[PDB]
Design a protein around this ligand. Sequence first.
Ligand SMILES: [Mg+2]
Ligand SMILES: [Mg+2]
Ligand SMILES: [Mg+2]
Ligand SMILES: [Mg+2]
Ligand SMILES: [Mg+2]
Ligand SMILES: [Mg+2]
Ligand SMILES: [Mg+2]
Ligand SMILES: [Mg+2]
Ligand SMILES: [Mg+2]
Ligand SMILES: [Mg+2]
Ligand SMILES: [Mg+2]
Ligand SMILES: [Mg+2]
Ligand SMILES: [Zn+2]
Lengths: 129, 242, 107, 151, 173, 125, 146
Amino acid sequence: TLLDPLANALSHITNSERVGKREVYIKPASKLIGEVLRVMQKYGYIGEFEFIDDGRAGVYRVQLLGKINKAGAIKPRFPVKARDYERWEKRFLPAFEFGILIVSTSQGVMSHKEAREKGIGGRLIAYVY
Amino acid sequence: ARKGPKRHLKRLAAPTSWYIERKAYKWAVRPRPGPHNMRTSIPLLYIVRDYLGYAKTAREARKILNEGKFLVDGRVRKDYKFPVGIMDVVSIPETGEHYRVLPNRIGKLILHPISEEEANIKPLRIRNKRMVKGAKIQLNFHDGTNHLIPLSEKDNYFTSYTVLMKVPEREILEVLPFEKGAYVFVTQGKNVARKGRIVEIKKFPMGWPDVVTIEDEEGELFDTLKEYAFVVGRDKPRISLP
Amino acid sequence: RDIGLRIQPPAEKCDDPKCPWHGHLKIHGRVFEGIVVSDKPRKTVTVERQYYHYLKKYERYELRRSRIHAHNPPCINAKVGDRVLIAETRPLSKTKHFVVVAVLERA
Amino acid sequence: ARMHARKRGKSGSKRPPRTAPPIWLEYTVEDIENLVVKLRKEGYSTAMIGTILRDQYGIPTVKLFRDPDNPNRKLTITRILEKHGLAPEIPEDLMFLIKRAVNLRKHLEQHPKDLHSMRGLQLIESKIRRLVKYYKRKGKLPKDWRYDPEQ
Amino acid sequence: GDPKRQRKKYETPPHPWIKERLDRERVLMDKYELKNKKELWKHETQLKNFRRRARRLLAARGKQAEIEREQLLARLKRLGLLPEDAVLDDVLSLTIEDILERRLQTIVYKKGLARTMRQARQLIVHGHIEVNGQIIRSPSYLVLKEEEDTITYARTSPFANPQHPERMMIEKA
Amino acid sequence: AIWQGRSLRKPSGGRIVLARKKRKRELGREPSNTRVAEQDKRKIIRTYGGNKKVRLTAAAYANVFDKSGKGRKVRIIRVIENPANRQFARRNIITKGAIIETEIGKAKVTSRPGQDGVVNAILLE
Amino acid sequence: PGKKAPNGEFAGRKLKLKRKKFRWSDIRYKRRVLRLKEKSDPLEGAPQARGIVLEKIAVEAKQPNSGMRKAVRVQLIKNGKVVTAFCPGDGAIKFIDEHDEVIIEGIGGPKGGSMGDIPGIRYKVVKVNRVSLKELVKGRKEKPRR
RNA sequence: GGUGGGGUAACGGCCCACCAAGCCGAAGAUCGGUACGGGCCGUGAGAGCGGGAGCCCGGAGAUGGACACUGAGACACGGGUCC
RNA sequence: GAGUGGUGGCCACUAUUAUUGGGCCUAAAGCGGCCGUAGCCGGGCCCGUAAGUCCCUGGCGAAAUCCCACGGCUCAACCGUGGG
Ligand SMILES: [Mg+2]
Ligand SMILES: [Mg+2]
Ligand SMILES: [Mg+2]
Ligand SMILES: [Mg+2]
Ligand SMILES: [Mg+2]
Ligand SMILES: [Mg+2]
Ligand SMILES: [Mg+2]
Ligand SMILES: [Mg+2]
Ligand SMILES: [Mg+2]
Ligand SMILES: [Mg+2]
Ligand SMILES: [Mg+2]
Ligand SMILES: [Mg+2]
Ligand SMILES: [Zn+2]
């Protein structure tokens, strides 16, 4: 059965970008997926996106630009402290500032660079590069 | 200690508040029971030999002590195992010098030179207070000494207050209350050797110790245990501090 | 009456000398909160508390549970299934070293 | 997929997204409640009443009207029946499954060698136990209620 | 547990017979006139340690990190291995020849106190060389920059006389 | 002799292998069964730390206290009942909580004769 | 086969149990923990042993090699067992006599066992009457007591 | 486990008299094997894997098994009794 | 190179124990098939709580051992004063 809407969205995106699709539809929407999409758009990985209302949980429509090498979810959502971002970067990313880790903190969802600037930790939920 | 009390002390196991070389020899002086506790005092022999340097070997240090050349709180001490602790006054009258024993910024005991007039007074923290037969009040200070007061003055003394005592006559001449705005000097913990003024007091249930907040000279605030705060004046120190 | 816990005392009184509210017993040390899982013996309950333990090698958690036997004063008289608050005292039997002081949520 | 057969049927309803009832619908809420009570008194099941309303009276699902008493929730057939005391004592699907199991058991008494039909009985009773556990959790059944075929 | 055991201060090669490494090390040994391979290896280890400290501090941050960074730079330029205006990155470009140039033997040879490396080694060992008023007999001692200029013949040595037969031959070069 | 160290059985019922000898500071002593007699008899025990306990073996008098706070020294007739042991009453054994009869009525013992060396009782109404 | 399991955040106990369960399939781990080698080792964990020679024999090499390898039977002092030991060297067998005492050690094959074309022999002779056998073979020394 | 006592320097099934049926367990009881615990030590890029004689802190023992006297402190390695 | 060889043990080699990070059509390896209890994993929105989780701050986790700079034995090994 369905267990993780967020993982399906990122796997769908990375599958679609490899065959040059220009847009995708994320089927079960949620606030968390919206936040992740906002963060991804801020750094220029995706184009514009919009929310479409059906009688069910709603759909997301996303424009792709062919600027993503890989995107995935992190399970389990490990907790991370404010000064331990380096080893996770080595575990998931290819260079010392290549891509972003997405962190859920008590102040919202943000990339690990902003969180390190604010000096706070949280839970890792995804990576994009 | 399988069958009885210990009598020896290795150099490597010596208390961490002393200035001593831990690998030079095997043994160290095991201090005698006395005024302060183990963690806040040092045997007199190390003061005579290692700190001041008046003696090179232990044997000649004992010859100095047996002649009564050293005064601790105005009383002659001949035992080389006698413990010397916080706020004590060490006086050498023949050379006319006086020191006060104080903790360092990192938690070690050092000697602070003081004037002759200041050498006659010792601050004592009221550690406990109880009733005794004949309906009198007994005060127990932080260095283990005791004093008696009549039932009439039972409201002028409470725990954590500081009493200025004239030595060696042991006569009271000043009482400093523990309240907001009092001047304090920290004696243990992470913030040892810092000084300042009291700002706030907090309490907790089920017997956890209470905490105080202190503002220093530059206006920074820091917290510490209430029992680690030693009152030394109303708004300015009454004694010289480094 | 207050015993340092800052909670409400029980409704009625008892004659047990081992009751911290009405007897001579004193409480000092740790204070725990748990769920009663057995009350068969006279004046005795078993309380279970759950927690998580972290396995460093596998960077994951596991669930562990702790069971403590406690004295049950007649003025309180806890039953199976309710949340209770227990405090540490002097030894009372071979296995009893705690006493129930309050019922937080009746079953 | 299906619970036991593992097939992947997709047939079902495709309800369009709408909030307010359509303009061409003319009945009011009270007429709808009267119709529901009448049909229930005729002896129909909850699922059948909605089918009749949709087919003959041109009323799409009654879940288009706000509940007049409780503004926070929309109106459903079971709530309408509850407001008048005609609600079933046992949830309908559980009742239907139990009724199916009773009829099958008396068949297997005359045909002890019909092993392929017996597996159907086992699956039906598994469904029954799942449902009874769920309903006990939510408080729709007394905690002592038990399903015994020997009844 | 177990008490402390003192450990070696150098590291041996992972594989004893690699042709390229043998050639390179033979060239170094012949040029600087060392006694045995382990001596050479010792200096190599020193270099590695420096590099390993620079790599760790680049990716660090905090209060202690700055202190250790400036301490490393000060120590390196006190030895004469870096110019006065060097930065942390320049640590990663040091070579093995840089360290070997700081040995007392090499410095004695370069200053002209001897004609040959081996002669310099013998002069050091027999006690004819003084460094800042002190006699040192270890040819592998690393010379600080501040004391480099005060290196002479020992004031009680026979060589501390310009009429000595052997000194004149040294001056002849 | 009498050892009061620890149980050799775990609460789950498993056995325990003893891992050391018995220390001197863990030993008990013989119970003192205080009897009723014509004349009193007591001894002194030297205890841990060089202290003392006064142990009473034969009792003849008692101190009986009233609700008013006044006491009288009277002699003991016999033991009526003793809830501690089923056969102490027959053998005339005095312990805390026993019921005795005296020349002025029945009384209930409130002291520990084996630990204090005296008998104190409250008068029953 | 699906994804490796368990992966959940709160599934530590099952993961640890799985890893512990399948570690017993590793023969190296099983032999060490159960101490199987110690239970059958005639040398009882020693690196060398001392024994007394009973007789001289010769063992044929395995195919396709050809030749006779000289060995002796040795009775161990510490426990009285009897083993076979090889005598390395050209003509080394002439320096051994019956009722001499020898020191033997492992022969150095794979997995601490036999080597080369002589399986069944696990030990080699090192000293004869407290004198190194290699010397006796080369010269430089003479066998004591004739 | 409860009630009432004894004993101890002191709380306690530590030991008794009386009243109940409890307590532990597949989240591994009970039983068997092996071993003094720790600070630490060896190895590896790290995650880990292996060891824990020597120096410090804690424990236990004096040919094996039991038991006492003196003393603030022992059931005492260079003190006592039995097998 | 004043050392250099032999035997036995542990780690690495080894992603041949795999959380990071392995495999199961034909090479070792998917129960003959299914139902289901504990366990583990679990759809969307709103309100509350603050156990997990994150940040700040008090009291602790002896010394020796480890890393860094400076100082004393000719430098070093070793030892002392400070920072971790
Ligand atoms: Mg161990
Ligand atoms: Mg050990
Ligand atoms: Mg290999
Ligand atoms: Mg493989
Ligand atoms: Mg199959
Ligand atoms: Mg098969
Ligand atoms: Mg969900
Ligand atoms: Mg919390
Ligand atoms: Mg330490
Ligand atoms: Mg020097
Ligand atoms: Mg130096
Ligand atoms: Mg040192
Ligand atoms: Zn009560």
